[PDB]
């Protein structure tokens, strides 16, 4: 990960802005600046941004950003980001291009949410939504 300073983030207004920030972080491998991007992004806007500007590495970046950073800030925002991410179309191509040992990271994402009892979601809601990820 680069020692040279991080590029500053203003919120994504539209799919190209979301994609152009994210692809810069996929260039730096930045999970922590990606975590700031989810801390400012809405789950409702997220699948509309991911429409055409969604790739294998940029999907995996946000997954590793969730199962490390956002789980310790708000696991219910992780749950809602994963809920609306399941509505994205190109999302379903990603789970086919990802290798089995890299797909396990998506399991560890839900395994950390399973560990958290929460005022916004339940295990019943987890085990229902994870089905859209075929885990």
Curated annotation (Swiss-Prot):
Provide the tissue specificity: Present in most tissues, including lung, with the strongest expression in brain, colon, kidney, and testis. In sperm and testis, detected in particular in pachytene primary spermatocytes. Up-regulated in pancreatic tumor tissues and not in normal pancreatic tissue.
Superkingdom assignment:
Eukaryota
User: Which residues pair up as cystines?
Assistant: none
Q: Where in the cell is it found?
A: Cytoplasm; Dynein axonemal particle
| More details | Antibodies against SPAG1 interfere with fertilization.
Explain the purpose of this protein.
Answer: May play a role in the cytoplasmic assembly of the ciliary dynein arms. May play a role in fertilization. Binds GTP and has GTPase activity.
Q: Which disease is it linked to?
A: Ciliary dyskinesia, primary, 28: A disorder characterized by abnormalities of motile cilia. Respiratory infections leading to chronic inflammation and bronchiectasis are recurrent, due to defects in the respiratory cilia. Patients may exhibit randomization of left-right body asymmetry and situs inversus, due to dysfunction of monocilia at the embryonic node. Primary ciliary dyskinesia associated with situs inversus is referred to as Kartagener syndrome.
Q: In its UniProt entry, what is this protein called? A: Sperm-associated antigen 1
Species of origin: Homo sapiens (Human)
């Amino acid at each position: 990960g680069p020692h040279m300073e991080k590029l500053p983030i203003a919120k994504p207004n539209n799919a190209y802005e979301f994609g152009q920030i994210i692809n810069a972080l996929s260039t730096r491998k930045d999970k922590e600046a990606c975590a700031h991007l989810l801390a400012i992004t809405a789950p409702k806007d997220l699948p509309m941004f991911l429409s055409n500007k969604l790739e294998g590495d940029t999907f995996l970046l946000l997954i590793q950003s969730l199962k490390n950073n956002l789980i310790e800030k708000d696991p219910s925002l992780v749950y809602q980001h994963l809920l609306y991410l399941s509505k994205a179309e190109r999302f379903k191509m990603m789970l086919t291009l990802i290798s089995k040992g890299q797909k396990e990271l998506i399991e560890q994402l839900f395994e950390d949410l399973s560990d958290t009892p929460n005022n916004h979601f339940t295990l019943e809601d987890i085990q229902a939504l994870k089905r859209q990820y075929e885990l």
